[PDB]
Amino acid sequence: PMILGYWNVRGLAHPIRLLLEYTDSSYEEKRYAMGDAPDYDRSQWLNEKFKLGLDFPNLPYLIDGSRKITQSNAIMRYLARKHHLCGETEEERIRADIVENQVMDNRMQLIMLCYNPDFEKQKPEFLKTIPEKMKLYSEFLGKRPWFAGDKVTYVDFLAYDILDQYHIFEPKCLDAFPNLKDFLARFEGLKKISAYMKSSRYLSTPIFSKLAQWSNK
Amino acid sequence: PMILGYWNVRGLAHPIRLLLEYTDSSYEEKRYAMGDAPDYDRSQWLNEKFKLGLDFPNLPYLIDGSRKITQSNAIMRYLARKHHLCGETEEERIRADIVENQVMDNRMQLIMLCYNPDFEKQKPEFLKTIPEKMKLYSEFLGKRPWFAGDKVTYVDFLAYDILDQYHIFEPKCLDAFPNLKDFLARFEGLKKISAYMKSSRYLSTPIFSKLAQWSNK
Ligand SMILES: N[C@@H](CCC(=O)N[C@@H](CS[C@@H]1c2ccccc2-c2ccccc2[C@H]1O)C(=O)NCC(=O)O)C(=O)O
Ligand SMILES: N[C@@H](CCC(=O)N[C@@H](CS[C@@H]1c2ccccc2-c2ccccc2[C@H]1O)C(=O)NCC(=O)O)C(=O)O
């Protein structure tokens, strides 16, 4: 099978795990565990980091036969090409490229807030920036079913993840944006996704490691 | 012509400026200035941030007729598709996708250090990690002339920028890796690039904004 390797956290592997299920991929995962405070041992990973034949060793990785890939975006693109879930026109490619990169910015922002010792102090200020973030997603989507246009593409897996994560952080953030709420329901309603979400493989939380100040357990 | 918008620094706009040059693109640039400490005024950008019709307002931005793009990687990709500077085979595409994202990782590592108020005391620990970073680029390129294979692609633009930045930071960091020294020379050897480096438009330094601890002026 293909092998997906990542920590036993949702983290940034969610979109890949969802895409693996959506495409009926034949895969197995190696979910590495971090030890506890104080050392947060990373040895299960460290002992084989340089022994997998990865060009730039990292997590997540995907082994697919002869192919070995690192960089979550690269894995997502690889699967997208494999299963034809890319933009098909120039307009669709642009929207996808924008979305991919924007999701990563919004991801980092959350991460940066959550790994900050002054979380509680920072939070209030961060919560006020949300509406403006959501409004940009909402206006970009507009009336389309999917972020790139008429067809589900790998970018919808990314958008779903970040919008979902945002919603968990601030449950009311999507109230003024019904098209985003509708997107989340349309995405979760895809058949394989629905099945996966009820399964033993599903890992919706924790989002971060033990180091974080939120969703770290 | 196309309009490229960014700060009046090299920052992450270097690969785009180089690619617009290498492609003989017709373009005009808007280089927004930031004020000095302690306020670091961003008003020149903020005055128009929400007036350019961008989906997700940011710097850099590319305006190409009716096409408005934000996200530096997206801008690179757009320009690459227009000029046929993408991988042509799956193997080139995979190599390109990894490098793109890897470059961003190594860029962010430099920023985390350069923006840390504790820069001077952090520096030694960072330096220690350089050789490993370079080694992985070195081994990845191996004997190829370019990062994706036998022809230049947009990812050489990003690779050039990051290797050059690290070399500026630690001049001796490429001594051990002749193939990296050679790639730099090859890149700079390109006629259009060579020509640009002598032009009035060339902006090598500062690397960072005025907020940084290094290469901020
Ligand atoms: N740009 C790359 C990034 C690869 C990378 O950094 N991997 C992390 C795990 S990922 C972690 C994370 C854990 C939970 C939630 C979010 C993140 C996250 C998000 C954005 C950026 C970096 C992170 C990270 O905080 C790691 O453990 N690396 C193995 C190693 O260094 O030996 C990608 O897109 O794949
Ligand atoms: N992921 C996006 C990143 C867009 C973005 O953050 N842009 C910054 C300037 S870019 C700056 C930088 C200046 C010098 C050197 C490096 C960077 C950099 C590198 C990686 C990530 C972020 C940065 C940044 O620290 C900016 O001023 N934004 C306008 C605003 O917020 O109103 C991209 O790839 O395009």
Curated annotation (Swiss-Prot), chains A, B:
It is found in: Cytoplasm. Changing C86S: No change in activity. Substrate binds at Y115. Keywords: Cytoplasm, Lipid metabolism, Olfaction, Phosphoprotein, Sensory transduction, Transferase. It is an enzyme of class 2 (transferase). The keyword Ion transport does not apply. Belongs to the GST superfamily. Mu family. Conjugation of reduced glutathione to a wide number of exogenous and endogenous hydrophobic electrophiles. The olfactory GST may be crucial for the acuity of the olfactory process. Participates in the formation of novel hepoxilin regioisomers. This is Glutathione S-transferase Mu 1. It comes from Rattus norvegicus (Rat). The gene is Gstm1.
